[PDB]
Amino acid sequence: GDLVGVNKDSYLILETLPTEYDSRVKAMEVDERPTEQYSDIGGLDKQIQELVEAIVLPMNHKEKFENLGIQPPKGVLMYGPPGTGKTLLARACAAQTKATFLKLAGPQLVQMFIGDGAKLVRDAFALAKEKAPSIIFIDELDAIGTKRFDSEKAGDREVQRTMLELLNQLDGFQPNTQVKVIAATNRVDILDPALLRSGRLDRKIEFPMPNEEARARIMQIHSRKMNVSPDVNYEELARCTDDFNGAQCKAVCVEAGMIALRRGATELTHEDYMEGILEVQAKKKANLQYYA
Amino acid sequence: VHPEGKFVVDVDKNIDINDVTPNCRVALRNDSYTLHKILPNKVDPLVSLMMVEKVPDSTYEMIGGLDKQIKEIKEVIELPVKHPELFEALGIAQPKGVLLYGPPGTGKTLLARAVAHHTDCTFIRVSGSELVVRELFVMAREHAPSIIFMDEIDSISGGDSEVQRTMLELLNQLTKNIKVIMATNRIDILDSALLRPGRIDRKIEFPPPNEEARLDILKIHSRKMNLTRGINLRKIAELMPGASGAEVKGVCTEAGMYALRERRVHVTQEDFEMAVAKVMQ
Amino acid sequence: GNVSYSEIGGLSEQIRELREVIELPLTNPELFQRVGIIPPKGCLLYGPPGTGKTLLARAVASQLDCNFLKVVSSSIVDKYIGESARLIREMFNYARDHQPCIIFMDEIDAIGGRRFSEGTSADREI
Amino acid sequence: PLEEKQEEERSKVDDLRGTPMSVGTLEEIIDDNHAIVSTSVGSEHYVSILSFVDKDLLEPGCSVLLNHKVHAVIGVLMDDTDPLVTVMKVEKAPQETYADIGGLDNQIQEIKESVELPLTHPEYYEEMGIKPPKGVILYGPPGTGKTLLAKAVANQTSATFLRVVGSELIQKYLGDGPKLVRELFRVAEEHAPSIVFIDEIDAIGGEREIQRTMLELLNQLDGFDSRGDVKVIMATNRIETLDPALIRPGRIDRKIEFPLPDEKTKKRIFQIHTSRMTLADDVTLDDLIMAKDDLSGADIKAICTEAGLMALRERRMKVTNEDFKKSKENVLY
Amino acid sequence: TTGSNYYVRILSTIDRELLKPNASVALHKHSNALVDVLPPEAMLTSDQKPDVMYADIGGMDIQKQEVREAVELPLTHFELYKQIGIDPPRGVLMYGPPGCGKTMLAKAVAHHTTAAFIRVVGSEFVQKYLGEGPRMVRDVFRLAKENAPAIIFIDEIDAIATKRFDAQTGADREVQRILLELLNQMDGFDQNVNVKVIMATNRA
Amino acid sequence: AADKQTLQSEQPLQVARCTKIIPKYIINVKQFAKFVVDLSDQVAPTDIEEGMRVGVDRNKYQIHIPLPPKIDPTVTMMQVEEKPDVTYSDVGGCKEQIEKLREVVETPLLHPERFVNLGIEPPKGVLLFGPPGTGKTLCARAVANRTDACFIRVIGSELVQKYVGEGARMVRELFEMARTKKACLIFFDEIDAIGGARFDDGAGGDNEVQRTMLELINQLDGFDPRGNIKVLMATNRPDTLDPALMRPGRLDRKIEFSLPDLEGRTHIFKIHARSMSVERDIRFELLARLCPNSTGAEIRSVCTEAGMFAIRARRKIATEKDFLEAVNKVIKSYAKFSATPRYMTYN
C-alpha cells in the first residue's frame, strides 16, 4: 500500500518513494508565523496562560510533566461570542512555538466528492505525524459542525463522513500522543458531544468580551504606531464605549486615525478617538432636539 | 462517436451528403475518419420513451361499456385532427386539452390510449420525470400529430399541474395537432389555474360502472380465456357494487387461477364466485 | 494496546456479556446446537459518547486470537463509483478466508442508513 | 481576379484544417500564440493557434475544435448548438392583432408605447430627452384580458420575443437553479434586442432556492449594465404575494392594470369570437351582460367555443340560441 | 468489451446461425474482425448451496402459495397456463417491511427448483470500469436463458433502481443505463421460454 | 496566414499537477499515472515548486513550460472591464456618504503617501445598507467607473451552486485569483443570498450555504498578509447577516443609504433634469415636497413617467402639470402594492 515507482515499458519496480497525497494538504505549511507576539494580545492573559500552558509546555517540558505521571492534554477548543482574540491567539501561539504548524480551515474539508473530504483529514494527521511534533489549528468548526439528526428525504451525510472521520483519527484508536489540536468556533450550541468527549477536545477555554480595563489596553496596543497626543485618555475611551468585542476597538483606533487625517493634521487627538467612535455604529436617528 | 462523443469528419464520393440527416447513426472513418455508407436508423428518442416506459399497452375498442365517453372523446380527438375543415368554417378556434376525471381505474391510460391509436396519432407519456420539460415539444412537433398524456397521483403538492400548464402556455399560442390529456382522480384537488374556462376544453367524466357495463367489461376480460358450455355471467355482476375497471381484470385472472389450482382446463362457474368473493378486501 | 479488562472500569456486565457472545461461540460451539440454536452474530454498542466504545474493542483487540478487523467506517468510502462495494466484498471475503474472525466497524453512520430520497450522488453511492 | 488567393487554402491550408478534426472545450487563453484545452477526456492540452483563423470566439471556453495528431485551435464552434433549444424565440407568429384584443384599450395603448414605441418610432425619446422605461408588470384578475394577450400582440410587430414563466424559473433537482435566468438573461441580452417574459412568476409549492432564484431575476435584471433589455413584461394574478423588491421603478418600470370587463367589453369582446361563427338572428346581451353578474374574458371564449361545438355535435352551422343555453349550463352553470 | 461498439466485417466460415443480438462473439486483436461465436460465458448456478426447508419457514402460507403459484409451478406446469389462458406472470416483486419472509422463502424456493436458480446481489452491477455493468447484467440474463428453466433472484433493487437520477456528474450516468437496458432486456423475453425474474427489496 | 513551418516546433503539451521534489519530481496528468520526471534544459529549479502546474510533452513525457493556475467558472466574474458611465457627479443626493465610501476605495491612488506617512492602514471592508430605492449599487458603478485597479464584481448567487462544498470552492478560488493582482478589490452584490444567520441541527436546510459564507469570512480575516483587497459589499438587509461578518476587520465603515431629505432630493431630480427640454420656469422644490418620502432611485420614474406624459400629449417640452400629473401617478397610485416601509423596518 505504499507509493513505489516502476518502469513505463518493462514494468519492474525500480525504487521506492515516500508516501504521498495532494498539495491541498501541503498548502498548510505556514512559515511566516511570528509577527504577532504575546504582547499584542491583551486583556486575556489567563487564556494565554491556559492555552500556552496547554500546548507548548508539552513541547518543551514533557519529561518533568511525565515525572508527575499524567497524560498530556489533548486538543483545546477556543470559543467566544462574535470576534474576540481567537485567531490572534492562534497565530500568536503559533508565532513563538518553534514547531511546525498547519492553518487548516473549516470548509477546506468538505468538497463535492465522497473521497476527498475524508482522505485529506486523515492525510492531514498523517502529515502531522510525519512532521511531528506539530500542532493543528482548525478554524471555524461550524463547517463540520452541523450534527447528526433523524434524517428523512434530504439530510446530509457528506459532512457527516468528513466529521466522523475527523474525530476518529482524533480519538479513535490509540496513537494520539504526538499531535495537539487547536479549535476555534464562534458558536458552540450547534455541536453534539461527539466532538466534546472529555479527551477528544480538552479544555474548553472561554473567550469573554474584553472587560472594563481590557479595551483600554487594546486601544493602547493597536494605536502604538500612530502619533498619539500626550493629552490622551484611553480609560475614558474604554468606560464610555462598553459593548465592543475587542475587534471594534482595534478599528476605533484605525479610523480614528483616518478621520484624524481627514482633518488634515499629521497628529491625532482625543476627539479624533472620541469623535471616531460616533462612527463605529451611528445608524443616524436625528430630530432629537427633544431628548432634553 | 460512441466512447468520446465528438469529431468533425469527411464523406466519401459515393455517399451523396444531402440525405444523411441528424440523429441517424452510421459511420466508417475507419482510420482517417471519412464516411462510407448508412445503417439501420437505430430508433430515435421517443421510440425510447415508449418502449422503455412500456407502460402504454395497445388498446382498441375493448373498452368495457363506455359509449357516451368515447362519443365525447372521439368528438374532440379525431375531429380536430382528421377533419379540421369544419372547424375553420364553423368559427371554432381550436379544441385542445381533455381532463379525464374518474375513480382510480375504469377509464384511464386506456381510453386515451385507444383513441390515440385508432387515429394512429402517437401516444407520448410524460408521466414521471425519471430519465431524460420543454424538449418533448420538439419530438411532438416532429411527429406531426401527437398526443401527450399525464399522471393522476393523490392516492390509489404541485406534482404535474406545473408541467401541465407549462405546456398549455406553449400550447395556447402555438405544429398544431398536438393534444394534451390529463387524467386525475378528482376534479377538485387540482389547481385553480386549471380552473380557467376554458383551459381544459373538455371535462369528460368517468363514473364507476353499473350492472350492465360491468357485465360488458367482465364479458371482455372473460373473453380472454376458456370457460364452459354456459356461464350466464350476471350473478358475478350481481355484486359489482362500487367495482373498478381493474377490480374486473383482477377477479377474472383470479378466477382463472382458481380454476388452475385443481389442474383443470375449464374455468367453471364457482371460480368466479370465489374470485369476487375473495377480493372483497 | 496491551489494554486489558483492568483498564475497563465499571461495566463488567457489558464486557463479560460481549466477551461471551463474541468469543464463547468460538470456545464451545457444541453447546449451542445442544440447546438447539445457532449462536448470534452481531452486537451494536449504542450509548452516549465517551463511555468506552472504541476502546472496549481495544480490550477485545488485545485479548483475542483471530484477526480482529478493526476499521473506521469512513475510511471505507472512496470517490470512484462502485468502489466501496468492492472494498466491503473484499473485506467479507477476507473474513471467509481466515476464520474465525471479528470485524470491528465503529462509528457507523457513514454507512448507517435511514435511507433518503434526494441527495442522489453522495448518498445513493453509499 | 480577387478570387485567386482563395484557392491556395485548399492546397496549403486545408491540409491542416480538414482532417478528423476533434472538438474539445477551450480553456484559459494564454497569450496569442497558444491556449490550453481540456479535451473530451479531461486531459488538458497546451495547444498552439492558427495564423489565418479570424479568432473572435475566445471566451474560456466554448467548445473550440482541435487537430487530431498535432493539437491546435483549428476552427471555431459555429453551429453553436444553442442551450435552451425550446425557449420560444418566435419565428412563426401567432394569430392576434390590434383588433381582436379590442377591449381594454387604454392598457394595450400603454404597453404599446412601453414596448413597441422604442422600436416603431424610437426617435421620440432622445429628441425629447428621457430614457425609455423598462418592462412592465401587468397584473390582473384571472381571465381579465388574457394578460398573455397584450404581450402576444406586443410580439407580432416587433423583433425577437423571448419568454420564461414561473415554471421555467423554479427548479427541482437544481440545488443549483438560478442558472436558468443567468443564461436566460445572457441569451436574452445577446439578441439586442429581445424581450424576456417572466410569464406568471408566482412561486408557490426548500423555500430558499426560490428566494435566491427571485434574487437573481432581481439582480440579473439590474446589476451593472443592460443591453436593449426592455421586455421584462411580467403577467401576474397575485400582486400582493410577490416580494416588493422587483419594483424599484428601475428593476421593474411603469406598470399597467385593469378592471375585469365592463359591459361595453362584454358586448365588444363577445362579438369578436362569434364574428367567426354563423349565429345571426338572436345574438343577445341579456344572456351575456347580467347573466353571470360579470363573466370572464375567457368564459365568453368558452361560451363561443362550447356554443358552436354544442351546436356542432348535431351537425349544423346554424344560429340556435337555445343550444347556447346548454352551453352556458355546460361550461359554468 | 473495450468500451464502444463499432463496425466490423465477419468471415464466411462462421454460419449466420448463432448470432443472437446478445451473442458473445470473438474479435481479432489489432483488427477487430469477427471470428467465432461462443458458449455463454459470464454469476453462479448455485448448485445445492442454500439450505432452509419450506417446512420450517413458519407461518407464511398465502405468500408461500403465491410464490409457489407464480414461480416454480409455471416452470413445471408450463402448459396448463397454455390450457386455460392466463399467462404466467413474468416477474415477482417482493416488498417486505422491515423483513420477515424475504430470504428464507427465496432460500427455500431454491431446493425444489430443478432449475438454474442463479443468484446475484444487485450491488456489483456498478463497477469501477465505465460502461461495464449493462453488459454484465445482460450476461446474467442470457446465463439464465441458456440454462432454462431458471429463476433470476436480484436483491435490494433500490440499489440500482430509484426514482431520482442525476443528469450531471456521472456517478449515476451508468446506473440510468443499468436499469434502462435491463428494462429493455426483460421486454425481450415475451416469447416465454423459461426465465423468471423474482426480486426483493426492504422498501418499495 | 503562413504558420506551416512553425507548427512542428511547437510541441503540443499536456498540463499536469506538480508535487514533491526529491533532481526529480512527480507530475499528475489527472487522467494518467502521476509519474516521475525532471526539468528539461532551461527552466530554473527554483521556478517550479509543488502545487503549481506545468506542461508535459507526449513523446518522452517531460516538462518544458510552467503554467498559470486554473479559474474555470469565475472567469466571467473577474473585474468586469470597461465599466458603466455613471460617476460621482451622477449619483447625487447624499454628498457625504460618498466621501466615506470614497476614501476607502481610493487608496491605491494619491492616498498611500498619507497612510505610509501617518502610519495608517486603510479599512478593507465597506458595507452599504439601504432600502431598495437608493443607489445601493449606483455608487458601486461609480467606484467601478474610476478605480485605477481591478473590479471583481461577484453577485450573491454565483456561489449557491448545488454540490456540497463546491460553493466554498468558488469563493476560495475567487480569492486565489484576487491575490494574483496587485491593488485589487471586490464587490459582493446582494449578500443576503448567503445569510440565514446560523441555524439549528434539526431540519438543516441552509447548511451548504452556511459553509460557503463561512469560508468567505475565513478569507476576509484569517492567516494572511492579506494583500489589499478593498472589499465593498451592498445589500438591502441588516442582521440576517450574522455577526463575524459585520464585525470590523471584514466590513468596517458600514454606510447607511437612507432616503434623502428635502434638500438632497431636489438634487437628484437635478440629476434627471439634465434632459427632457423642460419648461422656462419649473418649481423643483415643489416636486421635492409633493413626493417627500419616496426613494432616491425612483424620482427617475417621475422623470421618465412625466416625459411619457409629454410625448403622449405631443409636446416638445415638459410643463408642471405633467410633472404634477406624474407625481399623482407614481406616488399616489403606485403605493398600493409597491412597498418600501417593508424594508425600512429592516433598514
Ligand SMILES: Nc1ncnc2c1ncn2[C@@H]1O[C@H](COP(=O)(O)OP(=O)(O)O)[C@@H](O)[C@H]1O
Ligand atoms: N485581546 C486582543 N488583543 C489584540 N487584538 C485583538 C484582541 N481582541 C480582538 N483583537 C483584534 O481582532 C482581530 C482578530 O479578531 P479575532 O478575535 O481573530 O476574530 P475571530 O476570533 O473570529 O478570528 C485582530 O485584528 C485583533 O487586533
Ligand SMILES: Nc1ncnc2c1ncn2[C@@H]1O[C@H](COP(=O)(O)OP(=O)(O)O)[C@@H](O)[C@H]1O
Ligand atoms: N371499461 C373498461 N374496459 C376495459 N378495461 C378496463 C375498463 N375499466 C378499467 N379497465 C382496466 O383498467 C386497466 C387500465 O388501467 P386504467 O383504467 O388506465 O387505470 P386508472 O383506472 O387509474 O385510469 C386495464 O387493465 C383494464 O382492463
Ligand SMILES: Nc1ncnc2c1ncn2[C@@H]1O[C@H](COP(=O)(O)OP(=O)(O)O)[C@@H](O)[C@H]1O
Ligand atoms: N469505562 C471506561 N473506562 C476508561 N475509559 C473510558 C471508559 N469509557 C470511555 N472511556 C474513554 O473513552 C476513550 C475511548 O473512546 P470512546 O469512549 O469509545 O469514544 P467513541 O465511542 O467515540 O470511540 C478512552 O480513551 C477512555 O478514556
Ligand SMILES: Nc1ncnc2c1ncn2[C@@H]1O[C@H](COP(=O)(O)OP(=O)(O)O)[C@@H](O)[C@H]1O
Ligand atoms: N379581448 C379579450 N378580452 C378578454 N379576454 C380575452 C380577450 N382575448 C383573449 N382573451 C382571453 O385571455 C386568455 C389568455 O390570457 P389571460 O386571460 O390573461 O389568461 P391568464 O390571465 O390566466 O394569463 C385566453 O383564455 C383568452 O380567451
Ligand SMILES: Nc1ncnc2c1ncn2[C@@H]1O[C@H](COP(=O)(O)OP(=O)(O)O)[C@@H](O)[C@H]1O
Ligand atoms: N415467517 C417466518 N418463519 C420463520 N422464520 C422467519 C420468518 N420470517 C423471518 N424469519 C427469520 O428471521 C430472519 C429474518 O428474515 P428476513 O428479515 O425476512 O430476511 P430478508 O430480510 O432477507 O427477507 C431470518 O433469518 C429467518 O430465519
Ligand SMILES: Nc1ncnc2c1ncn2[C@@H]1O[C@H](COP(=O)(O)OP(=O)(O)O)[C@@H](O)[C@H]1O
Ligand atoms: N442620489 C441618487 N442620484 C441618482 N440616482 C439615484 C440616487 N439614488 C438612487 N438613484 C437611482 O436608483 C437606481 C439605483 O438602484 P439601486 O440603488 O442599485 O437598487 P438596489 O439597491 O435595489 O440595487 C438608479 O437608477 C439611480 O438613478
